[PDB]
């Protein structure tokens, strides 16, 4: 499953939409990729720092208190498990 997110966003708050093509339990993770390392910013499970609202097959993710922020979406159940990892969103705080 492909996950689309904006390549660039400008902000202390930054919001971006994360969209996936689901074929009922979804798990959303925001990962920050620094150097060649990955940190967890945000995580939540929904069953159709961070603020997440689900409108259909998309999640509106707002980060606050502000790099490459990777949107990760998982279809957990019913099987099959699906993993989607976005190309990442560059956020510019200035």
């Amino acid at each position, epitope marked *: *499953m*492909h996950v689309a997110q904006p390549a660039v966003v400008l902000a202390g708050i930054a919001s971006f939409v994360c969209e996936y093509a689901s074929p009922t339990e979804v798990r959303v993770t925001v*990962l920050r990729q620094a150097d060649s390392q*990955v940190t967890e910013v945000c995580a939540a499970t929904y069953m159709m720092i961070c603020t997440g609202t689900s409108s259909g097959n998309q999640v509106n993710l707002t980060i606050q208190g502000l790099g490459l922020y990777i949107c990760k979406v998982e279809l957990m159940y019913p*099987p*099959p498990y*699906y*993993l*989607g*990892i976005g190309n990442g969103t560059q956020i510019y705080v200035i």
Partner: antibody
Framework: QVQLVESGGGVVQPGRSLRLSCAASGFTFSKYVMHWVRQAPGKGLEWVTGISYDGRHKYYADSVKGRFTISRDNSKNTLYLQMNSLRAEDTAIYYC???????????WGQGTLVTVSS | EIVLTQSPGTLSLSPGERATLSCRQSQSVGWSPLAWYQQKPGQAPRLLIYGAFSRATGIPDRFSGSGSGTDFTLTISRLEPEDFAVYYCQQYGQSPWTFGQGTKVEIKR
């Protein structure tokens, strides 16, 4: 330093049962999908079963569905494989593997050998 | 169920030469959750590449991956003696997690 150490392998008679354990350390066990992957002698890698972060979701290869059961204890930081109805073709090295947050199997145990023979 | 097919079955090369390994998957996923593993005899598999082209931690520069869609390639730019082993590709985008059947990189003589 991530470590995964499998134990419990040995010789088992057909039709019987065996429990494997994978003791994890060096990472927050609860935050990763865990798997069992096996390799029969002279053959390739075959994914057997995996289990979600919290233990609530279990996924199985058709080859073992209904015979093998995966579980995890996120306090002991241990992964389990309960093998029932064992068959000669289940003879394999059984590896414990961690799923990186970006998806691949980024750490593997050294494996434990299960030999199914009468 | 995504099936991975590797080619060739065996590559026969000498140290210092370039190794090109192919992996084809039965359907595209919209992205590349495609990993490569190395396995030396009597040793567990070791992750080399994920996301088609990203190097795993501690993996040397000579290993690189490329491709997209259904068509992926692992390249070892200049083989070292420790690189003669079996290499597996894998898709990790959906269950069941599936592997290619492996490619042996052997010493040519």
């Amino acid at each position: 330093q991530v470590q995964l150490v499998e134990s419990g392998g040995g010789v088992v008679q057909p039709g019987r049962s065996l429990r494997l354990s994978c003791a994890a350390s060096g990472f927050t066990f609860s935050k990763y999908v865990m798997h069992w992957v096996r390799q029969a002698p002279g053959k390739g890698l075959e994914w057997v079963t995996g289990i979600s972060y919290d233990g609530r979701h279990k996924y199985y290869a058709d080859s073992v569905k209904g015979r093998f059961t995966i579980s995890r204890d996120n306090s002991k930081n241990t992964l389990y494989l309960q093998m029932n109805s064992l068959r000669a073709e289940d003879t394999a090295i059984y590896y414990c593997a961690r799923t990186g947050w970006l998806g691949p199997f980024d750490y593997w145990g050294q494996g434990t050998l299960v030999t199914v023979s009468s | 169920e995504i099936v991975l097919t590797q080619s060739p079955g065996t590559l026969s090369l000498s140290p210092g030469e370039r190794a090109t390994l192919s992996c084809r998957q039965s359907q595209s996923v919209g992205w590349s959750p495609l990993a490569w593993y190395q396995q030396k005899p009597g040793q567990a598999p070791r992750l080399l590449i994920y996301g088609a082209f990203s190097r795993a931690t501690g993996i040397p520069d000579r290993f690189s991956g490329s491709g997209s869609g259904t068509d992926f390639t692992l390249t070892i730019s200049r083989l070292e003696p420790e690189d003669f082993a079996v290499y597996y590709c894998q898709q990790y985008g959906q269950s069941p997690w599936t592997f290619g059947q492996g490619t042996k990189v052997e010493i040519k003589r």
